[PDB]
Each structure stands twice: as C-alpha cells, then as structure tokens.
C-alpha cells in the first residue's frame, strides 16, 4: 500500500491545562498536565493515521529522552519512521503550551533553537515510489525547493496513476518560504501569512495570492472560526463554514488536523469542496477534545 | 563518611526563560529553554552535593522517561539513591516554569496530582547509622511524624557524637503540616506559612511561632529580599540581610538553596548566626545564575 509522507518538524509539547491564565510571579495548580508529541508535519501524521491512511514522517531527531518518547509515540500511531534523520548535535525542542479551558485560548512558548533541518541531500534517499502523496511543511525553503524539483522530475517519467501528489504548507510569515507557493498541487497558506502580506480575509487572500501558485494548483486558506476557503484552476471560490464544538477546549494542532484531513479527503478521490468541508469538520471536532485520538 | 539524607519530592521542571511575560493566545520565542530536576528536597540535595557534602535522596519515582532523566541527574551530582521508592502507579510530575529575565519573576504551574508519598513503612528500612543529618520536606505529615519519632527513638540509644541531627521544612500553608513544628532541632518555616498564620514579618513570625517548636529547637524564617531570621533557645533574635545579585535572573529553588546551605553550615560546626549569613550568601548568589551548578 502506498503511503503519505509528511516532511517537517517534531517537538515535544509540554501541555498545561488551566481554567485561569497564570498570574505572573505565582505558583498555581493546573487542571491537568501532559506530554504530547507535536510539530506541524508530525501532528498531520497523527491525524492521517487516525483517519486510516498509512503514513510516514521525515524530520530531524537527536538522541535522548525526548527522542525516545517521540519515536515510541510515532510507533503507537503506526507511523513509518524509516526516513527520520538522526542528528549528532542539538536537541529536539520542548515547547511549553498553556491551554485555558475557560476561554479556549492557546499560548505557546517555543525554543530559541531548532535542530538542523532535513536537507535536499537527506531527501535524495527517499524512495518516491513508496508514496502516493508527499506533504512538505515549509521550513528551509531553498532545500525544500530542491526536494520539490526532485519529485517533479520523478513524476515527469511516471504515467498518470503513478504520479506522486504534492502539497506544501506556508504557515510562518517568512519571505523565504514564499518560494514554496509555486510548488505542489495544493498550497496551504496560514491566516498569519495572509495578514503579513496585507490580506484581511480568506477570500481577499485567495484572490491576491492565487497568481503565485503553479499552473493548475489549488490555494487553501483556513481562517480559524470563520471556516476555510479555496481557489483552484476552475476559478470558483469555495468556502466551508467552521464546525465549532460546543466548547472550545484544545486548539493545539487544529490547523494540522485541518491540513491532514483535506489531504486525506483528496487522496480518497473527493472534490475540493468536499475536502474543505471534511477538513473543517474534523478540525472542529478536534477543538472540542484534548489531543487527537478522540477524532476517531 | 556519614551522609545527609533529604526526604521529600522530586519533579521535572520544564523551564522557559523569557524577557517578557507571555501574552495569552500568542506563540512566542523564548530566550532559552531547558529541563531541570526539581522538588524541594531534591534541590536541597543538589546544593548539598555542590557544597561538598555526601548526601542521599529519598522520594517516590515511577518508571518512565522522567525517572530516567531524574536518576541520571542525581547520579551526575553524586547523590546516593539506594532509598528511592519506585511506585507502580502514577507519574512523576512535570512542572512548567516561566522565568522572566526582565524582572526576575518566577511563575510555576504544577501538577494536579502527585505520586504516592514516601510512607513511614518505607522509612523503616532506612539505616539511620548511615546519616549525620536527616532533613524532611513536610508533605504527608502523619506519616512523617512517625518517621521523626523513629529517629528520636534511635537517638535515645546513641551517645552524643552518634545522634542524628534532624531538620524539617514547613513550606506549604496546610494545617496538617503544622504537626511538624514540634520535631527537629531546626524548623524552616516559609514566608507563605507565616502570613497564612497572620504574621507579617520574619521577626513577628519567630516571636509568634517559637512556642510550637520542640524544647531546644531553632526556628528559621527566610523572608526573600528582606533576608532571613532565626530564634533558638538562647532567646536571641538573629537576622542576616539578603545578599542580592546584581541582577535577579533565576529564583527557582532559591529557598531550597538557603535551606541546604544552612544545614551544611550547621553540619560543619558553625553557629546559627554564621549559618544564616552563609545561607543568605549562597541563595543570593544562586539568584544571579541559571540553575545551581554555578554556586561553586
């Protein structure tokens, strides 16, 4: 069975669930605390696996307690790990998350430093025939452009049923990541990126950014509680409302849940309109529960 | 060589160093992040070892990644672990700490749940002849009173040079811990406890609480930037000013550093006046550096 590969980041999330945001200079009891594997591409693998797809994760690790936890958790979710890249310096980041139950707020404190990223040389070793879909979390764009060019060259020699589908996520507002707009059949652009580029709504972002994507691609822009929108080569602006839970309890990884669910739905042959709705449905369900496993 | 035993808690501290307190609902970069072994008795062992005393830690653990980290860190500090209690249920807590560099503030989010505590039955197995000093972090007072009675019964059969010295810490404002005032030759009472009992300064706390201690004992009350005070059987109110660093950068474990340093100084034969000064000196130095190792 062909797999879906996600290339990007893994971290350890240290999660603190509170009913009031902590007052500075105090020591207070949480409602609950837990460790949770995180990172955009890593979370997307979790969701793909829960939805039933065979998937693989490619990202950097360094030996230690965090790696042991992360690898055990990936195995618990049947995620294929043959392409992880073991580094000899640095640490896997431990991000601190505060989730406020009373309001649904999500506050993240992240590492000043990240491990060396998966390079184009690392990616050269991936057997592309094992994958029906490859999703790249935008990080080190110059190296990732080389990976995407390698996939394109592979696909140029494959017949239609053997081409590898490609998606990219442009989530951080860094200009170097905008090189990625012109790769992939599906480009996920975050609300933060859209606003950094001057666009104040999903529809405005689609109309303003569509000219950057590869000919024939679809641009997707989720806009949190306002749902998600897409624009592809047929020229039709698509929109799904969000599917909010009765109470927002945990939004950590909600965007990754949306992305993975859109990928899953498209991989099963559904239209972009159906995939957008499905992504909003699964992400909204996730926002009403802790972690990911309860999306079932 | 006789050891100093500390009975109490170990946790994993997940530390986030920031120059601005995090704004709720945002995702922001720290100046630095690290894992650090914590818990009052555990931190006191770290400081005793750094000062050169042979010491031992007795506390509960449960198997897993946190235990592996904690035990490795205790070994790195030459802390004797033969009396740790391995539990079959629960988790070692992971506490989240936010340290604000701009102000010196310390914010702690701690676990709703803690492991089963070291019991009197567990303590019955400790060979008291191995120890010249036993320090108990007040937690489960009814069990700990039984431990303290066992030490007293042991000491009643020992000559003067073979008696085990005893100290207790009463740090949390829980009425059941106040049973511990009447045990030990040295009782450390926190500012928080003093204020819960209605006393608004160290001197007022000493005069108001001294009647609770065992005949002949010394009550010690540190009051943060106002230094620390003590009152013993000679009737003399003692005080040391604090020794603040040029910039307060990290106060996590400062109270444990004070307690351990007082214990160390007394164990070396110094007076309470000298030990109070020494404790303020080491704790103030610690407040100007990250972690403990730099106290040298």
Q: Count structural domains of chain A.
A: 1
Assembly type of the chains comes to: homodimer
From the alpha carbons, calculate the radius of gyration of chain A and give it in angstroms. 19 Å
Cross-sheet strand order for the largest sheet of chain A = 5-1-10-11-12-13-14-15
> Could you tell me the number of beta strands of chain A?
15
Which structural class best describes the helix and strand composition of chain A?
alpha/beta
At CATH level 2, the architecture of chain A is 3-Layer(aba) Sandwich
H/E order of the elements of chain A? EEEEHEEHEEEHEHEEHHEEEHH
Fraction of residues in H or I helices of chain A: 25-40%
Strand-residue proportion of chain A: 15-25%
What is the general shape of chain A?
A: globular
PDB class: transferase
Keywords: sugar-kinase, cancer metastasis
Assembly: dimeric
Entry title: Mouse Ketohexokinase-A without ligand
Describe the structure.
- It is classed as transferase.
- 2 copies of one chain form a homodimer.
- By secondary structure, chain A is an alpha/beta fold.
- The first copy, chain A, has a single domain, classed as UDP-N-acetylmuramoyl-L-alanine:D-glutamate ligase, CATH 3.40.1190.20.
- In chain A, 29% of the residues lie in helices and 25% in strands.
- The interface between A and B is medium-sized, with 33 and 33 residues.
